[PDB]
Structure formats: structure tokens, C-alpha cells
Amino acid sequence: LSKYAYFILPLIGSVTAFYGGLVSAFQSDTKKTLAYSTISHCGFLMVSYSTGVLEFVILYLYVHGFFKAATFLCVGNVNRFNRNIQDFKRMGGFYKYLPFECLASFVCMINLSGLPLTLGFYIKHLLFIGLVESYTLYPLIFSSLILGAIAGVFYSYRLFYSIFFDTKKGKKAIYLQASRIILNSKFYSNTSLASNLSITFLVLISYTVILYLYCTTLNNYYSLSDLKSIYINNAYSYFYKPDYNFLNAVSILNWFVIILLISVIYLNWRWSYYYTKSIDSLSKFILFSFFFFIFSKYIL
Amino acid sequence: YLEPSYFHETFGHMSQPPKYDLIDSNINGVEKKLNKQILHREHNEHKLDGFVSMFKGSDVAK
Amino acid sequence: SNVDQHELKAEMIKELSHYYDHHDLSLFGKVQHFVEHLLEEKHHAKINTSNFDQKKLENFSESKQISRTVFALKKIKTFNHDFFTSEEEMILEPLPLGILTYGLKYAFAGVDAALLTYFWRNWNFNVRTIGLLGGLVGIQMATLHIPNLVNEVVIQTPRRRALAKKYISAYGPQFFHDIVNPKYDIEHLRHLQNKLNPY
Amino acid sequence: GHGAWNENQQHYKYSKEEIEAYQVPMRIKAGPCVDTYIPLKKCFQENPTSFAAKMLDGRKGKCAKEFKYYNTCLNHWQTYENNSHVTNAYWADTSKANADGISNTYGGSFRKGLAWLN
Amino acid sequence: KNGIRDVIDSLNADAGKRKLINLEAKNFIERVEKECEQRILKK
Amino acid sequence: GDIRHKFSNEITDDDYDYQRAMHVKPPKEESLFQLTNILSSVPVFKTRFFLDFIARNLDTNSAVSTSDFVAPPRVHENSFFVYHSRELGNVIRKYRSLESIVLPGALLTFTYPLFAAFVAIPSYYFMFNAKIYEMSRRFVVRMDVLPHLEMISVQRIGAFGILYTKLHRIQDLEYVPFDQVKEQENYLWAIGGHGVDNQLIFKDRSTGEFFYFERQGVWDAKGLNHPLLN
Amino acid sequence: MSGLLRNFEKLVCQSQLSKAGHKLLLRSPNSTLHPTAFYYKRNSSQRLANEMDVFQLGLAAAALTRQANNYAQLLDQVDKEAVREEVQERITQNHSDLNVYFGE
Ligand SMILES: CCCCCCCCCCCCCCCCCC(=O)OC[C@H](COP(=O)([O-])OCC[N+](C)(C)C)OC(=O)CCCCCCCCCCCCCCCCC
Ligand SMILES: CCCCCCCCCCCCCCCCCC(=O)OC[C@H](COP(=O)([O-])OCC[N+](C)(C)C)OC(=O)CCCCCCCCCCCCCCCCC
Ligand SMILES: CCCCCCCCCCCCCCCCCC(=O)OC[C@H](COP(=O)([O-])OCC[N+](C)(C)C)OC(=O)CCCCCCCCCCCCCCCCC
Ligand SMILES: CCCCCCCCCCCCCCCCCC(=O)OC[C@H](COP(=O)([O-])OCC[N+](C)(C)C)OC(=O)CCCCCCCCCCCCCCCCC
Ligand SMILES: CCCCCCCCCCCCCCCCCC(=O)OC[C@H](COP(=O)([O-])OCC[N+](C)(C)C)OC(=O)CCCCCCCCCCCCCCCCC
Ligand SMILES: CCCCCCCCCCCCCCCCCC(=O)OC[C@H](COP(=O)(O)OCCN)OC(=O)CCCCCCCCCCCCCCCCC
Ligand SMILES: CCCCCCCCCCCCCCCC(=O)OC[C@H](COP(=O)(O)O)OC(=O)CCCCCCCCCCCCCCC
Secondary structure, eight states: OOHHHHHHHHHHHHHHHHHHHHHHHHOOBHHHHHHHHHHHHHHHHHHHHHHTOHHHHHHHHHHHHHHHHHHHHHHHHHHHHTTSOOBGGGOOSOTTTSHHHHHHHHHHHHHHTTOTTSTTHHHHHHHHHHOOOOOTTHHHHHHHHHHHHHHHHHHHHHHHIIIIISOOOSOHHHHHHHHOGGGOSTTOOSSOHHHHHHHHHHHHHHHHHHHHHHHHHHSSSOOOOOOOOOOOOOTTHHHHSOOHHHHHHHHHHHHHHHHHHHHHHHOOOSOOTTHHHHHHHHHHHHHHHHHHHHIIIIIO | OOOTHHHHHHHOOOOOOOOOOOGGGGSOTHHHHHHHHHHHHHHHHHHHHHHHHHHHGGGSOO | OOOOHHHHHHHHHHHHHHHHTOOOOOHHHHHHHHHHHHTOOOOOSOOOOSSOOOOOGGGSOSSHHHHHHHHHHHHHHHHOTTSSOHHHHHHHSOOOOOHHHHHHHHHHHHHHHHHHHHHHHTTOOSHHHHHHHHHHHHHHHHHHTHHHHHHIIIIIHHHHHHHHHHHHHHTOHHHHHHHHSTTSOHHHHHHOOOSSSOO | OOOOTTSOTTOOOOOHHHHHHTOOOHHHHHSSOHHHHHHHHHHHHHSOOOHHHHHHOTTOGGGHHHHHHHHHHHHHHHHHHHTHHHHHHHHHOHHHHHHTOSOHHHHTTOOOOGGGOO | OOSTHHHHHHHHHHHHHHHHHHHHHHHHHHHHHHHHHHHHHOO | OOOGGGOTTSOOHHHHGGGGTTSOOOOOOOOTTSHHHHHHHOTTTTSHHHHHHHHHSSOOSTTSOOOSOOOOOBSSTTOEEEEEESSHHHHHHHHHHGGGTHHHHHHHHOSOHHHHHHHHHHHIIIIIIIIIIHHHHTBOSEEEEETTTTEEEEEEEOGGGOEEEEEEEGGGEEEOOTHHHHTTTHHHHHHTTTSBOSSOOEEETTTTEEEBOBTTEEEOHHHHHSGGGO | OOOSSOOOTTSOOHHHHHSSSOOOBOOOTTBOOSOTTSSOOSSOSSOHHHHSOHHHHHHHHHHHHHHHHHHHHHHHHOOOHHHHHHHHHHHHHHHHHHHHHHHO
16 A cells, blocks of 8 residues: 555666676676675565565575575585685586585585476566556566566676686696695595585575476465465466467567577687587577477478 | 466467377268267357356356 | 357358467468368368168177277266366376487487488488488388387287276276267267266 | 356355354455355365375366366456456457447557557 | 555556456457358348 | 505595596506497498498598698689688588578578567577678688789678679789777677787788688798799 | 588599699689779779879779770670660770870
């Protein structure tokens, strides 16, 4: 029953989402990147509450909290290995030195940054399903939301690639101190076994709890407990029986994310021995994608 | 696998692999022909009935 | 006397198909849809069933009787959906396809796409390559049916025969023979009720 | 049988005390499918099942008879809430819809995106 | 008449408009059925 | 330096063998399910049918280069070649050839060709045009010199992979330092200029057209030392 | 290079290319190896000598002379006068252009 809430929650939420997403994408420090991503996700939470589906807000909160915590733990292990240097401009080729962190970070980041075919895609999908359109500043709100949503890909890719699979940029000591043959042992590791087990169990339990909440809320049979609110938003109508208009509208954002993924993957910023072969691989991928789509849809 | 919604809304509905039952092969001849025609008519009528029922039932909830 | 329901439904279908039976197709999709509608099966509003009278029940050998009972159960399910329970409905439906079938189909699609990509990139188009592509596509299409046939002939068939035996014991062969006969009243079939269904 | 999409198998309308007993979330109580929802909830209570089973079972297993009525009611409720049955018809053929106006109120303002010029 | 009054009025108007759209769709389907019946009879 | 042998329960190379998938080490032994082992064991592949299929139906040795010196066919009966592009030229050709298959195919297959075009337009203008297309337009596939005209014939890849040759007077060629163009076309050189040489850019003063030469391109010593070009 | 169910008998082996003086000529689409029509300016805002070189003027003059000779052959082998007027007009234009170019 608050006019001020109605006007302020969506605008500030979307502005914060866009700002945090872009700053996180352009960030170079791991903890700063996670902090700005947290700001962006809090903006998205504000916008979800503005839409007014408390179930969607709770789902977004759970997903963000679990995967943000897991990613924070992974980057903490990375920083400890790198001797308290949190900037990944001095991090490179850490995949071999921190094998568990690399894969755990991959999973956690793909879930955190809303990406297709991941547990974290549905939260953004539901937010866009519930977004209201009667606002006066709807153009700015929607544009900021789209930019913030797409911004996830850049920061996730930069963090993961620069930390792990980029060229070795760190000090020679970091690698040499750990590459000594004397250290080769069944006990060898640059992290803690307890830390690895804690991260693994956190990821497993987060997956299970998120699935339980998704079944409770998003299933055909609604089995969530009473929320003690008498305001019904009608947003579930576009989740149960979406129309062609909305179904095709979502495709715009899906393809925007696809193009951005292609850019961050196939775009060359430095000379390499694999420049021509990279362009050739891009051509092969495009042509194969076209033919595969043709066969799947028409020729079977 | 279980949630192809992203694929449907990003690439469209692809050709579905064949799925049918061979119950109709039990009968043969004019019996089979007439029953097949009746079933086809029933299916079309069922689709139309669903459409008209959805359109009409807007006022069911008072 | 009263307006015929089948004729009214046929007119309404002709009028309203554009809404509930129309999708968005590309140019190739529209051409294919045009070809299908040309080589379609017309929606016969009225079927003349006064020429085929019947066959005597005694003629069948108690196995064709069970098969005809399976067909009668399918017809009952098609006309009224409340006759059978969930398990019986699952038995009567085609067995849903599985990961094996889907992966086989998409692996076929992938190999075909790779072959076309190779042919275009190397400009390797000729009679032999085109024939190879056609033959491979045909073999894949033929094979895609094999999983469904195997399912229907191995799993569903014995289950359907057992269900038919159960329902024959419940009702009687003549009860389902009448239903198999096309002269059976479709309205009575719609309003029919199942003894074995608790509902 | 032959009941409307909102009525349940038994054609029984539950009272306020019964709703409070089989407490229904406000999300469902707001809509018209309380009569079809309550039997489904009672069946689930009588035969509790895991969330994994609920997700992986497409027919709701034991509670299929009640879920059929509930699903039909849910489809009608959501379709009438979002007016999708008219929006889809206009999307399929705007010109014919205007020719025989399904709903002039929506037709006068409908404008399909230029990108979707099939 | 200020504050959330405007939002409440807009929501009420939108709900009324959606109900009107549903009613118009129902009227259209009834009209189509009647026209089809009359065409069948007049033959 | 290694002390793993001092303990009976310490890890072993037999325990580390599973990392050979993710770690590059020279081969030690062949598993029963390796492609090499399968081919060498199964007698089916030893059949002359399969052997002849391998020999014929695959990339031919004729197209394989046989020397470090290449003399491509002369463009003109009196001309002599100077520069030629080997790999980036073929890659650009194959990329631009997609406009003859994907584009008509997209038009005839996609449900919403307008949506495809609306997505492609901004994609072309950002991260694609400067990435590949402008570099290809300015790319020099081949360069020969006609002495009677005192001209240079330059071959270029056009739309849909079409190859066209143009003549430029040697008197109209100038060297453009990379410093004069880096700021003007930072994005082009940022994302797409890696293949071509930055410090060997030339342009035709009369027509104002640039010439990009592949870094992994073959030059002819005789062509470079010809008095016309010196 | 690469093919499936194909024979590359007609392909040029790389051995010939590696060899020198192999006597191979390249025919490629959209190839313009003759500069005729490059420097043919029908209207000049200034003297052609100021803007163009002797090489360019000679190319233009040779092209115009060849075209004029061909049109003269057309005049010789054509009979109808009405159709011949167009040929004569084209020849006159070519002659005027040739005169100005050769004077320059
Ligand atoms: C091999 C390594 C490289 C691979 C990289 C990825 C390549 C991606 C190329 C994309 C090209 C553009 C899109 C055209 C294809 C669209 C496919 C689609 O939408 O189907 C969704 C479909 C939609 O199916 P549906 O809509 O009929 O219903 C699915 C739901 N059930 C099952 C209940 C009916 O979802 C799938 O099931 C996908 C296939 C899952 C099983 C695949 C097993 C492996 C098959 C061989 C490998 C294939 C690799 C290629 C990529 C496969 C991706 C699934
Ligand atoms: C030395 C001991 C160390 C500690 C060991 C503890 C082991 C714990 C192992 C399970 C943890 C992870 C559970 C899955 C993640 C949560 C899933 C979820 O959201 O719930 C969904 C489900 C809820 O049920 P459901 O989701 O299947 O649906 C229920 C269906 N209806 C509603 C119809 C009834 O919960 C679980 O599956 C979690 C397990 C049940 C709860 C167990 C609590 C009691 C624990 C007893 C052991 C106590 C040991 C004490 C040791 C003391 C040492 C000092
Ligand atoms: C508002 C207005 C909107 C307008 C939107 C316009 C959208 C449509 C744009 C149309 C683009 C047309 C492109 C023409 C391409 C050729 C151009 C050209 O000259 O290049 C010659 C080029 C180069 O010619 P060349 O002479 O240099 O050499 C010959 C070829 N090589 C190089 C190999 C020796 O040749 C080709 O690329 C030939 C292509 C032939 C096939 C073309 C059609 C392929 C697609 C068929 C339909 C889709 C698949 C269907 C499958 C069905 C299976 C059952
Ligand atoms: C009409 C004028 C000419 C238009 C030319 C077409 C656009 C330019 C060339 C595009 C080539 C790339 C086609 C990829 C097709 C992939 C499968 C598919 O979804 O096709 C059907 C769909 C469209 O078919 P549809 O319209 O039937 O789909 C239903 C509608 N949607 C999807 C919106 C719900 O393809 C596309 O959406 C293509 C969008 C344009 C892409 C423009 C270039 C950016 C991508 C770079 C190339 C690599 C992309 C790889 C993608 C892999 C999978 C994510
Ligand atoms: C005009 C059409 C309507 C849409 C309007 C909007 C146009 C598109 C705007 C995209 C802005 C993206 C900003 C990303 C910033 C990332 C910063 C970062 O992390 O560093 C760079 C990181 C790389 O980080 P790195 O660490 O690997 O290296 C950095 C190297 N330096 C510092 C030298 C630059 O990512 C990128 O480089 C990719 C971003 C550049 C390419 C952008 C391509 C845009 C394609 C738009 C497609 C539109 C599809 C059509 C539909 C759109 C609307 C629905
Ligand atoms: C009388 C005898 C008659 C005999 C008749 C039968 C003969 C045998 C027919 C089947 C076997 C054909 C011959 C085996 C080799 C086939 C090779 C092929 O299909 O092309 C590979 C091609 C490589 O790239 P390309 O640009 O063509 O480079 C040329 C290199 N020479 O690939 C590409 O272009 C790249 C495509 C992929 C792009 C990225 C996606 C990666 C995944 C692709 C997987 C494709 C394989 C199938 C798996 C699908 C599921 C993943
Ligand atoms: C409304 C248009 C919608 C899109 C239409 C796409 C048409 C594609 C076919 C183009 C054929 C002619 C090309 C001419 C080239 C030339 O010499 O182009 C020369 C022109 C003119 O020169 P300048 O503009 O540099 O001065 O350059 C241009 O930039 C204008 C034309 C741009 C054509 C771009 C074609 C590629 C599009 C790629 C889309 C994104 C990638 C898609 C996946 C691979």
C-alpha cells in the first residue's frame, strides 16, 4: 500500500543491477568483482520484490546466496595460493596448481551468472516474467535490467579464464615454489582437503535445496506454505500459460547472451599462432550450427 | 533433457522422432478403414471442442 | 430434424482452424505445409457405414478376438477419456521415447551436419556424394522408427493383451465386438461408464 | 461428470471452515480452483511423496485422478487471467481477427513486433 | 485521492479491461457457433 | 630429489596414469580400446577394400606442398609474382563463402528472417565488421607486377568469396606508418589486425585504398629485388 | 585438396608450382589486367595535361582509336542510313576525344 515503494523499488533495483553488473564485468580484482556482482544481484532482488512474487524473490535469494558463497570460497583459496594478491592480472595458469578450485569455480560461476542450461537461469527468467510494465520509467528500468542481466557473462568469463587458463602472469616464485619435484607426493595439494570437502558438500546441499524450492513453487501442484499476503500479482499466468508474444520476447535476451558468449570466446585481442585457425574454427562452428539446425528441424 | 524450454524459445520446436502405437493394425479391411476415418473425425472434433470450450468457459467462475 | 452435430463441427473447424491449428513457418515450412495439405486426408464429416454390416463373432479364433478387444479399448479411450485409469491409459498410449532414441536422432543430425559442412568447405559436391547423403539420410530415417516398433512389439503388446483379457473377462467378447463394429453409437460410447474404474 | 472446469469429481464445494482445516495458500485461494485443489492436497497428505518424485512423475502417480481436474482448472484459470486464448489467435492471424473481431478492446491496441513478420 | 489511489485505480481498470476482453471472446465464439448453425440449416 | 620410493604406500606413476587425459605426457603403453590398437588388431581394417578406401577417399598428396619455394601461375603472360597469401587467404575465402549458403538458407529456413537480420545488424557493426570484414576487404590475396604497364595487380576477396583483381600504378604507391592509422582505426587493429602486418602497410594515393599483407605470407626474393620495385 | 568419393586427376600438382618456368597461366573471375577506361575522362574541369600523365593519355588515346576504327568498320559493313547516323555520331565523339587527348 506504498506509492513510494511502487515507484522506488523497481527504479533503484534496476539501476543498481545495471551498475553492479557492468562494474563487476570491468573489474580486475576477484573480491571486488564478487562484491559488485553482489550489488547487481541485490538490485535484481529489489526488482523481483517490485514484481511482487515472494516465491520468486525467495528462489533468487537462495540461488544467489549459495553460489555467491561457493564462488567466494573458491577465490579465497586462489588468493591464499597467490599470496594475498587478489588481482588476477598476476594470476595465470592456476588450473594445474588448483585443480579442484578450477572445476568448482566453473560450476559455481555458471550457476551464479545466469546462463542457459543452469540452475541460475530460472531466477532471471522468473524476474523477467514478473516485471511490471505500468511504470513511467519503464524504458530505463527495462534497459538497465537487460544490461545487468547480460553483464554476468563477462565477469564470469573474465574471472574464470584470467585466474586459471590465461598465460602465466604471476611472479616466478609462486609457480617455482610449488613445482619442486620433492613435493610430489600422495599428499601434495595447494589447498586443504577439509576446504575441498566443505566446498563440495556446500555445492551438493545448495543444489538439493534449490531443487526442493523449485519443486515447491514452480511445480504444477503448488505446495508452498502460506505467505500471509493477500496481494496476487498474476505473474504466474506467464509461467503456466505463456503466449507467443512473451515466448518470442524472451528469445531476444537469449540470443543477446549467445552473441556475447561468442564474442568472449572467439574474439582475439592479442596476436597468437592460432589466429587463422581460430577464425577457421569460428567459420566451421557457424556452418555446422546452421546445418545441424536444418537437419534437426526439417530433415530429421 | 527434462526442461527443453530454453531450446524451444531460443531455436524453435524441432522435428519430433516418431511416436505411435500399432493398435490399428489389429483390424483389417473396410472395418479398419471406417474405424480409422471415425477416429480421425473424432480427433478433429476433439481439438475444436477444446478450443470452443476454452473460449466459452470464461464466465464459469462467478 | 435438429442441426447435425457433425456438420456443425465440420463448419466450425473450417471457420476456426486458422486460430488453433496455425503455427509460424518459414518459406520452406510453408511450402511443405502446402504439400501436406494437398496430399492430406479430407475431414469427412459423415461416413457411410451402411455397406459393411458385420462379421460373425464365432468366425474369430479367440486371438483375433483379443486383438479386436484391444482396438475396442483404444476406441473407448479415444471417445471418452474418463473410462480408463492412469495405468491403463499409459498401457494404451505409445510408450514414450527415451534417451537412446533422442541421442541416436541427434547423433544422426550431427554426422549429417558435419558431412554437409565438409562438402561445402571443400566444394566436394558430385553425384556420388549426393547419393551417399541421400542414402545415409534414408537409412537414418528408417532406423529412427526401429525403437518405437521394438517398444510396441515387445513391451506394450503383452501388456495390452493382458488388459484385453482382463476386460473380456469383465464384460464379454460381444460387448467389445459391438464397439469394434463401426455402427456403434459414438454418443453412447462417449457416455459409457467403466465397471472396473472405481470412479 | 460433464461438470465445468472449476468443479471437482464429487461436485462438492468446500466451506470456509474446511478450507481453513485443509489450509490452502492464499495464492490458490485467490483463484477459482479451490474445489479442485483441495482433493489433490488431501490425496498428497494421505500419500506423501518426495519432491524428487513429484518433479520426475509426469502424472503425479497416485494422485492422478484429482490432478486431472486440478490441471484442467489451472489451465483455464491462467488462460483467462492472461487472456492468452485471444492473444494467440490475434498473433496467428491479426487480419482475420480484425475482420471478425474476437475482442475489439484488445484488437485496437495489438501491434505485433516488426521482427516477428512471419 | 492521492498516493496509492492511482495505482489501485489503474489495476482495477486493467482487471476490468481483461474481463471485458474475455467476455468479448465468449461473445465471438457464440456468434461463430450461431452463424455456422444457420449456414448448416440454410442448405 | 624425489623420495616417493622411500615409502610403500606412496603414490605411483601407475596411479597418475589417469591424468594423461588432462596432462600431456609421452605415450607409455597402448590400451585395448585405443584407436591405434583397435585398427591394428581387428582384421576387418586389413581388408584391401578398407585400405583402398583410405588411400582414395581423403585429402590428396597432390595438394600437399613439396618445397619451400612456390611459383604460382602467372596472372599475365608478362607479369611476375611478388607476394602471395597461404592460409589467411583461404580462411577469409571460406568465411566469406558462408554468405552464399547461410544467408539464402537463413532466409528460406528461419521463421523470422527480420529477427535474424535485426540481430545480425548490430552484431556486424560491433565485433564483426572490424573483426573480420574490413580486414578481408583490405587483405591482399596475391600481388604481381606487370612491367610493361609498370603496374601492380592485386587480388582481393569480395562478397560471397568472389575473387577480383585490380591494377595500381607503382608511382601511386606509398608507405603509411602505423602511427598515422593506429588512433584512427584502433578497434580494427585491436580485434582484427593481428593476422596482417602492422608495419608493412601500403596505400594507393590516387584511390586511397590500403594493402594488408599476411604475416605468414610468402615473398619472392627476385620480385622484391626487381628494379621496378626498388 | 580434400574430397570424398572424388578423384583429383585434373588438379595441378604442387610439384609443377615448386618448379620454375612451368608455363602456367591463371584465369580468375573479375580480372582486369588492362588499364583501358581507367583514365578516360569525358569531361575535364581543367586541362588534361595538368591532371593526367602521358601514360594515361596514351592509354585513353589507344582505346579511343581502336573503338573509332571498329565503328568505321561498322560504317563500311552497314547499309541502312538511319542506323548509320548513330554510328557516325559515336565516331565523331570518339574522334573529338582522340584529338583533344592527342593534342595534350
Ligand atoms: C560434440 C562436442 C561439440 C558440441 C558443442 C555444442 C554444439 C551445439 C550446436 C547448436 C546448433 C544450433 C541449434 C540446433 C540444434 C537444436 C537442438 C534442440 O533444440 O534440441 C533440444 C531438445 C528438445 O527436445 P523436444 O522439444 O523434442 O523435447 C525434449 C523433452 N522430452 C525428452 C521429454 C521429449 O532437447 C533435447 O532432448 C536435446 C538432445 C538431448 C540428448 C542428446 C544426446 C547426445 C546426442 C549427440 C550429441 C549432439 C551434440 C550437438 C548438440 C546437442 C544439443 C542438444
Ligand atoms: C558425525 C556426524 C556428522 C554429521 C552428519 C550429518 C549427516 C547429514 C546428511 C544429510 C545432509 C543433507 C540433506 C540434504 C539437503 C537438504 C534437503 C532438503 O531441503 O530437505 C528435503 C527433505 C524433506 O523431505 P522431502 O523433500 O523428501 O519431502 C517430504 C514430503 N512431505 C512433505 C510430503 C512429507 O529433507 C531431507 O531429505 C533431509 C534429510 C531429512 C532430515 C534429517 C534430520 C535429522 C538428522 C538425523 C541425524 C542426526 C545426526 C547427529 C550427529 C551429531 C554429531 C555431533
Ligand atoms: C527489405 C528487403 C529484405 C531483403 C533481404 C534479402 C535476403 C536474401 C538475400 C539473398 C542472397 C543471395 C546470395 C547469392 C549467393 C551467390 C552469389 C554469387 O555470385 O556467388 C558465387 C559463388 C562464387 O562463384 P565463383 O565463380 O567465384 O566460383 C564458383 C564456386 N567455387 C568458388 C567453389 C569455385 O559461388 C557460390 O557460392 C555458389 C552457391 C550455390 C548455391 C547457392 C544457394 C545455397 C542455399 C540453397 C537454399 C538453402 C538450403 C536448402 C537445402 C534443401 C535440402 C532439401
Ligand atoms: C532476411 C535477411 C537475411 C538474414 C540472414 C540471417 C542472419 C545472418 C546469418 C545468421 C547465421 C547463424 C545462424 C545460426 C542458427 C542456429 C540455430 C537457430 O537457432 O536457427 C533458428 C533461429 C531462427 O529460426 P526461427 O525464427 O524459426 O526460430 C524461432 C524464433 N525464435 C528463435 C526467436 C524463438 O536462428 C536465429 O535465431 C539466428 C539469429 C541471427 C543470428 C545473426 C548472427 C549472430 C550469430 C553468429 C553466428 C553463429 C551463431 C551460432 C548459434 C548457435 C546456437 C546458439
Ligand atoms: C544496437 C542494437 C541494439 C542493442 C544495443 C546495445 C548494443 C550492444 C552493447 C553490448 C555492450 C557489452 C559491454 C560488455 C563489456 C565487457 C567489458 C569486459 O569485461 O572486458 C572485455 C571482455 C574481455 O575481457 P578480457 O580480460 O578477455 O580482455 C580485455 C582486453 N582489453 C582490456 C584490451 C579490452 O569481453 C569482451 O571483450 C567482449 C565485449 C566486446 C564485444 C561486444 C560485442 C557486442 C555485440 C552485441 C550483439 C547484439 C545482438 C542483438 C540484440 C541486442 C539487444 C537485445
Ligand atoms: C563404395 C563405398 C561407399 C562408401 C560410402 C560410405 C563412406 C563413409 C561415409 C561416412 C564417413 C565419411 C568420411 C570420414 C571423415 C568425415 C570428415 C567430415 O565429416 O568433415 C570433417 C570436418 C573437418 O573440417 P573441414 O573444414 O572440412 O577441414 C577439412 C580437413 N580435411 O568437420 C567440420 O567441418 C567441423 C564440423 C564440426 C564443427 C564444430 C562442432 C563439433 C562437433 C561435430 C561432431 C560431428 C561428428 C558427429 C558427432 C555428432 C554429435 C557431436
Ligand atoms: C537490412 C540488411 C540486413 C542484413 C543483410 C545481410 C546481407 C549479407 C550479404 C551481403 C552481400 C554484400 C556484401 C558486400 C561487401 C562489401 O564489399 O561491402 C562494402 C561496403 C561499402 O564500403 P564501406 O561501407 O566500407 O565504405 O561496406 C559496408 O560496410 C556496407 C555493406 C555491409 C555488408 C556486410 C555483409 C556481412 C554481414 C554479416 C552479418 C553478421 C554476421 C552473420 C554471421 C556470419
